[PDB]
Amino acid sequence: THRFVQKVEEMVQNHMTYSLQDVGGDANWQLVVEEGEMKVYRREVEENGIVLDPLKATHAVKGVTGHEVCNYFWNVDVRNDWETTIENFHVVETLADNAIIIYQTHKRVWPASQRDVLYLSVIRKIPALTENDPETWIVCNFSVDHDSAPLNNRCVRAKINVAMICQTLVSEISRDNILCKITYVANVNPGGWAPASVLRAVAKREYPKFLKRFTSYVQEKTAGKPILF
Ligand SMILES: Cc1cccc(-c2n[nH]cc2-c2ccc(F)c(-c3ccc(S(=O)(=O)CCO)cc3)c2)n1
């Protein structure tokens, strides 16, 4: 039992309560980009001059399970196969077999300075709320403080709360008959000065490119392997 067990429970339950809700019907969410079943939405939010724009996306991916998608998203050993904006990353602390603390730096977005981030990354299976409902696999990545935080004078420290939340629908089961329903939420505080139009333009381009590249990577690596439910 590590020191972040309560915090983890809170952050995960908040996503389970609030992040799964539908936004198709909700005019407070702007639909920014659509590519088939991938639907990317945002709200435009600025606090004390800093652009926070909550991002929420849904997607439906054939032929992979939620457990698989979450394992690929959490497993630091495959990070470089799908990430494209990371410059450096270091595992700061191992809390449990399902929870680590990561420090990473990102590629600069001109003309703002580079960003770094220091977060707890946890993977959990959440049982079905009623006998009717699906089980959920979730990865939550959320900023924390740590005394071994790196000094990096080129970087402004962002703060994140991200979740990759998956429910899996199925019909001996073939990958032909499985579909993973994803909700991805990203609440990024850039942590200092950054021009709003540029941040918005980069979010609009990069979030869809990330979701497409990541989800296709999982399909590619699990093809012709036995399913892990
Ligand atoms: C996916 C995406 C969308 C929009 C912009 C960018 C980007 N381009 N250049 C710098 C960044 C940047 C700056 C600060 C950050 F915290 C993250 C950040 C993004 C996602 C996540 S995660 O938790 O989804 C995946 C683990 O990295 C963590 C940090 C990314 N990347």
Proportion of strand residues: 35-45%
Q: What structural class results from the helix and strand content?
A: alpha+beta
Count of domains: 1
Radius of gyration: 18 Å
Give the termini separation.
Answer: 26 Å
Q: Briefly, what CATH class?
A: Alpha Beta
Listing every helix as H and every strand as E from the N terminus to the C terminus, the arrangement reads HEEEEEHHEEEEEEEH
Quaternary organisation of the protein chains: monomer
Task: Report the principal-axis shape.
Answer: globular
Count the strands?
Answer: 12
* Total of DSSP H or I helical runs spanning 4+ residues: 4
Q: Can you tell me the CATH architecture? A: 2-Layer Sandwich
Bound molecules: the ligand Cc1cccc(-c2n[nH]cc2-c2ccc(F)c(-c3ccc(S(=O)(=O)CCO)cc3)c2)n1
Helix % is 10-25%
* Annotated CATH topology: Alpha-D-Glucose-1,6-Bisphosphate, Chain A, domain 4
Largest sheet composition = 10 strands, mixed
- Any idea what the CATH superfamily is called? START domain
Subcellular location: Cytoplasm; Golgi apparatus; Endoplasmic reticulum
Binding site for an N-acylsphing-4-enine: 83, 104, 141, 184
Subunit structure: Interacts with VAPA and VAPB. Interaction with VAPB is less efficient than with VAPA. Interacts (via FFAT motif) with MOSPD2 (via MSP domain).
Protein name: Ceramide transfer protein
